[PDB]
């Protein structure tokens, strides 16, 4: 599968970019894509939205 969490708080490449390195490098084939203008973080390759959303938070972030 391919999840999609709104993060509407996400703003720039730099809070992005956090979000982007905290989902893959704790699951090695999460395809992350955190757009700050459609403020939307993808995971492709991955069914586990829950365990997603547990690395996504611990980052600070909401995974909507």
């Known amino acids: 599968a391919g999840l999609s969490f709104h993060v509407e708080?996400?703003?720039c490449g730099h809070c992005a970019?956090?979000?982007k390195g905290?989902?893959?490098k704790?699951?090695?084939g999460a395809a992350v894509h955190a757009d700050p203008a459609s403020?939307?973080?993808v995971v492709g390759g991955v069914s586990?939205?829950?365990h997603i959303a547990e690395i996504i938070t611990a980052?600070?972030?909401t995974p909507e």
Do not use: K, L, S
């Open 9 to 11: 708080d996400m703003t």
């Open 17 to 19: 970019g956090v979000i």
């Open 22 to 24: 905290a989902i893959e």
């Open 26 to 28: 704790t699951v090695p």
């Open 39 to 41: 403020r939307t973080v």
């Open 48 to 50: 586990d939205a829950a």
């Open 59 to 61: 980052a600070g972030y």
